[PDB]
């Protein structure tokens, strides 16, 4: 039995002061803290993996309620989702990732990303590819307003 | 054999109108009528299944003409597409959909989304994962001009 | 064994004269020479192929350095890509491509496209799939500023 999975993330370059309306802290969305990192690369790959295993997404495993005081570093979330993944008897068949950013050149930091993702998934550098494209100056990634990332992963077990 | 598939759909919230030019009625684009529903989730997922079997896509299984007076419900189309997909000796391995929408709040209904797809795909909920993410207020999905969804498929049999 | 591979590529429609500042001729971005041939489909497919073998992406094997003089014919880069996916011992189990574009009518030339693809990818026609959608005038594609393509590819052996 094999599992196909897909994840997708977007995050703007700007920072936002937290929303307080009426004296109350109000989150902008469901898995807000889970995504605070802004690591589009590890979140997409996370929901990809989660999605194959058929477990929802970052927002169902890390609601802002449980994520309230727990550590929200994306790498750690990756790992925790891989725990639940393996928990259903699954090894990272293979994983492919596309970062979509116009500018911040990433070629330099790419093999280092694979390295880490490999460990977090307990597979090896070879079943983990990571690339980067630009939307050729178009769209919001192109106008340099944010950065995106798509991810696919195949699961074996 | 096992087959991978992918489909993508974008829809505006706005209601466009029957185009009538010089007497004649001009058909906006091809799978226009079938899409009119604007259910990016079901359409994209359908596109993924057809793509998996190299069956084409929604604009080829449902030209405006053929779709003209044939009832435009996109759930039957998904069924249909899947009917054509068994006729090739293909069963649904598993399915994974990402819905990209800002304000529209999907968490409540996602499980009822999951429910339906499985009947139609005659598969079991457990092999149908569904999810929503937002583009962090960026893009056309973030300015609230519309909605999108990517879907991925693994066909077995 | 099986490898999942995903690819994405965006192309603008305009051309960018070759730069000259202070005498010197300045190059634009890493893989602009490759992507110059503005063929979002063959490029998106190329990357999904490499993504799965895990050879990175075009601009990797074709740096604006090597390719300083290499030919901007996306079909060649595709065959070269399929070359390395052979060394590693890989067959094209299955491929699916989605063209996101607002107006050039693709539909009539799809089939012409799948042929060339099956050619360079040495496989059968029911092995390649090419579909085309619009984003209902939303985003940079619908504003007809550019064209984008998504590809997902399976590999065997
Ligand atoms: Co995120
Ligand atoms: Co649609
Ligand atoms: Co290109
Ligand atoms: Co994609």
Curated annotation (Swiss-Prot), chains A, B, C:
SUPFAM superfamilies named among the record's database cross-references: IpsF-like
Annotated positions binding 4-CDP-2-C-methyl-D-erythritol 2-phosphate: 9-11, 35-36, 57-59, 62-66, 133-136, 140-143
Cofactor note: Binds 1 divalent metal cation per subunit.
Keywords: Isoprene biosynthesis, Lyase, Metal-binding
The keyword Flavoprotein is assigned to this record: no
Claim: Oxidoreductase is one of the keywords in the record: no
Transmembrane intervals: none
Pfam family, one: YgbB
GO MF term (any one): 2-C-methyl-D-erythritol 2,4-cyclodiphosphate synthase activity
Pathway entry: Isoprenoid biosynthesis; isopentenyl diphosphate biosynthesis via DXP pathway; isopentenyl diphosphate from 1-deoxy-D-xylulose 5-phosphate: step 4/6
Residues that coordinate or bind a divalent metal cation: 9, 11, 43
BP GO terms, sorted: isopentenyl diphosphate biosynthetic process, methylerythritol 4-phosphate pathway; terpenoid biosynthetic process
EC number(s) stated in the UniProt entry for this protein: 4.6.1.12
Cofactor(s), by name: a divalent metal cation
CDD domains documented for this protein: MECDP_synthase
Reaction equation(s) it catalyzes: 4-CDP-2-C-methyl-D-erythritol 2-phosphate = 2-C-methyl-D-erythritol 2,4-cyclic diphosphate + CMP
Site (Transition state stabilizer) residue list: 35, 134
Entry-linked InterPro entries: MECDP_synthase, MECDP_synthase_CS, MECDP_synthase_sf
Enzyme class: lyase
The organism's place on the tree of life at top rank: Bacteria
Subunit composition and interactions: Homotrimer.
Similarity field: Belongs to the IspF family.
PANTHER family listed in its UniProt record: 2-C-METHYL-D-ERYTHRITOL 2,4-CYCLODIPHOSPHATE SYNTHASE, CHLOROPLASTIC
Function statement: Involved in the biosynthesis of isopentenyl diphosphate (IPP) and dimethylallyl diphosphate (DMAPP), two major building blocks of isoprenoid compounds. Catalyzes the conversion of 4-diphosphocytidyl-2-C-methyl-D-erythritol 2-phosphate (CDP-ME2P) to 2-C-methyl-D-erythritol 2,4-cyclodiphosphate (ME-CPP) with a corresponding release of cytidine 5-monophosphate (CMP).
Stated name of the protein: 2-C-methyl-D-erythritol 2,4-cyclodiphosphate synthase
